[PDB]
């Protein structure tokens, strides 16, 4: 199959910026290249076909260029409705393979997270499990490391995290990490700690509590 490579995988830009994103095909595909926009929870929308032809109804700030192996999508003046993921797709040879997508996110200054930790509820402990939640609130950029420590032992395999979509008001992310233990395991340990690493912090921030204190 033809391999489609998009660059970069994500980029940060401001409203009014000129943004370019690239797509490479592993062989010449002539001008047979589509560009799509996708937003969370929605189907892809065709913006550009045949490398440079605008689909009906697409704003003229969108343009495409290139032929052979190397293609670009330019947005001449980025608008708030343009923050989205973009995909390229070759239409030359079946199967009509896609690039891996480029996410265009809102640029802002670095913002350290506010870190909050939540012990398990008595309701949950009665039900036989213990979830400890570590909240990183309103930070930028999206990259963050959360490490769980139980009595200063680093945990693996017993936590999961997820991150919000960028807030369109302050352009920050939030992250929730949940450490889940059995009730028996929770009761064998005292000190529950989440250690947060982020560009906005000059050194790691630890939030912790002692079980039953």
């Amino acid at each position: 199959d033809i391999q489609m490579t998009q660059s970069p995988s994500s980029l940060s830009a401001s409203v009014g910026d000129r943004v370019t994103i690239t797509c490479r095909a592993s062989q010449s595909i002539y001008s047979a290249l589509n560009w799509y926009q996708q937003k969370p929870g929605k189907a892809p929308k065709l913006l550009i076909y045949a490398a440079s032809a605008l689909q009906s109804g697409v704003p003229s700030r969108f343009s495409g260029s290139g032929s052979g192996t190397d293609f670009t999508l330019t947005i001449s003046s980025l608008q708030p409705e343009d923050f989205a993921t973009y995909y390229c797709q070759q239409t030359d040879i079946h199967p009509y393979t896609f690039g891996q997508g480029t996410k265009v996110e809102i640029k802002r200054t670095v913002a350290a997270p506010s870190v909050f930790i939540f012990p398990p509820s008595d309701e949950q402990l009665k039900s036989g499990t213990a979830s400890v939640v570590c909240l990183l609130n309103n930070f930028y950029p999206r990259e963050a490391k959360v490490q769980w420590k139980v009595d200063n032992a680093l945990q693996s395999g017993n936590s999961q995290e997820s991150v919000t979509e960028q807030d369109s008001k302050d352009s920050t992310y939030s992250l929730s990490s949940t450490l889940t233990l059995s009730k028996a395991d929770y009761e064998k340990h005292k000190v529950y700690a989440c250690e947060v690493t982020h560009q906005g912090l000059s050194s790691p921030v630890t939030k912790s509590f002692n079980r039953g204190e």
């Binding site: 189907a43 239409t91 309701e123 919000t164 949940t178």
Partner: protein
Amino acid sequence: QMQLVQSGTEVKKPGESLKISCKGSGTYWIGWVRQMPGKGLEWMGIIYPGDSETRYSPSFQGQVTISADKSINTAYLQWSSLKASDTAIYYCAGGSGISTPMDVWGQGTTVTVSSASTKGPSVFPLAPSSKSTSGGTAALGCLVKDYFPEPVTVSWNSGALTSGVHTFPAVLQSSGLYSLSSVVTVPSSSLGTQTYICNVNHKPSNTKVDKKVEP
């Protein structure tokens, strides 16, 4: 508008068969696209319903059947034996004329394949404390744990509280049940003055929970 209308959400067990549909209203070919959760678009294959000529991406050849009924402008994607790894959104796409390929898309069919069974969430408080207070701001929330399938909705104070609310994407646990948190930041001086209730609805299990979150 030329449009492609797909069949509704599916929740299946491993080994079950499944046929989903794509109907044209208002294309001489219909393609199929897979999007696994949190992943990009993948081309599966194409059918020309005039005479049902099909082609498959080598990755999908022998894994799925594409077919069509020209008489009712419908194309299909069929599995005889679903796997958990078939969990995805499936889109159909076509061409509204001879010059613009892939200009019409279906709305997508969400397919979940799991051994898990329908189950309503447990809703646990994330209580505000000194361990969740930062210079006059407190955080509080609800842990909406161990439900299947997606989705759940969360509001605060019946939709009256929206400022500072973060409702996270669910994670799929090793149990096959989802879990998500919803948090809000509030003035710490409001604790004990303003009531904070998370309203959780899980339609697949007919579960509605209103959980008061107190210090």
